[PDB]
Amino acid sequence: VPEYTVINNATVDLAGFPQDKDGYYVIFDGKTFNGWRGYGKDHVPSKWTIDNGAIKFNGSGDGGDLIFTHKFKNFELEVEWKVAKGSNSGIFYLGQEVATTKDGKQRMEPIYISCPEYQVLDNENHPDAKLGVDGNRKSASLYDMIPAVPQNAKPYGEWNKAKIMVYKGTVVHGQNDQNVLEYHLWTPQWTEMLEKSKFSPEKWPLAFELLNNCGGAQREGYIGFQDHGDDVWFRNIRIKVLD
Ligand SMILES: [Mg+2]
Numbered sequence: 209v210p211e212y213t214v215i216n217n218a219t220v221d222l223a224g225f226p227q228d229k230d231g232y233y234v235i236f237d238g239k240t241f242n243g244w245r246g247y248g249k250d251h252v253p254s255k256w257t258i259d260n261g262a263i264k265f266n267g268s269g270d271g272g273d274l275i276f277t278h279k280f281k282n283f284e285l286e287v288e289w290k291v292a293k294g295s296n297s298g299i300f301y302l303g304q305e306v307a308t309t310k311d312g313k314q315r316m317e318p319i320y321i322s323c324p325e326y327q328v329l330d331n332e333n334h335p336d337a338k339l340g341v342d343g344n345r346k347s348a349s350l351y352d353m354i355p356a357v358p359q360n361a362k363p364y365g366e367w368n369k370a371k372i373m374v375y376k377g378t379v380v381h382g383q384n385d386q387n388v389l390e391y392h393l394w395t396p397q398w399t400e401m402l403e404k405s406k407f408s409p410e411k412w413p414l415a416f417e418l419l420n421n422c423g424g425a426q427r428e429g430y431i432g433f434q435d436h437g438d439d440v441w442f443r444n445i446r447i448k449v450l451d
Contacts, residue, residue: 215305232446247273248316262441275432282450295438297328302429321415348383356388
């Protein structure tokens with residue numbers, strides 16, 4: 209349970225983002241990075257680019273995770289995602305910006321110790337596919353806790369549809385228009401899933417604390433995308449706030 213700080217940085221208003229006919233805010237205009245910032249940074253990392261109306265991570269600028277600068281709570285996110293052959297990325301939700309102080313200097317902690325990830329992956333050609341228990345490291349899974357069933361991912365190079373819903377602590381992941389798992393935050397079963405994971409209280413104290421109390425006191429958090437050194441695209445990014 210170390211000394212941790214949560215950084216509070218400016219969040220944009222949703223008013224600035226148009227809403228579509230079904231009520232979903234469009235938080236990527238297909239042309240610009242308005243509303244987006246690199247986690248732990250004051251600027252869009254340069255390996256993130258706009259390619260053909262997609263946000264794209266240029267594998268091989270500075271890198272790091274990219275977030276949208278609005279804290280969501282009850283919401284339904286929809287995204288399309290394409291990976292290149294062997295690509296790894298992911299979609300983060302309820303994230304917090306965290307720092308610890310070691311040796312009098314502030315250091316950024318990764319977003320994945322504060323919040324869940326919906327993995328993004330070429331399941332056919334990437335070694336993480338093999339590496340969990342029961343596929344919990346293949347695409348759409350809650351990475352290293354809960355597998356996606358069914359695993360209806362398309363082959364690399366194609367656009368996949370992702371849904372992440374969080375409603376009053378209930379979470380559902382969607383892939384290509386099926387719901388593929390469900391869990392419940394801030395419960396003992398949640399506590400348990402964490403004790404089985406790499407975020408176990410013994411294997412990683414500060415992660416367990418943040419994940420068990422996911423979304424802080426106010427249960428709200430940033431959405432974002434993972435830099436994991438590989439080529440990936442996202443587009444049609446929209447989010448409905450829930451009422
Ligand atoms: Mg990943």
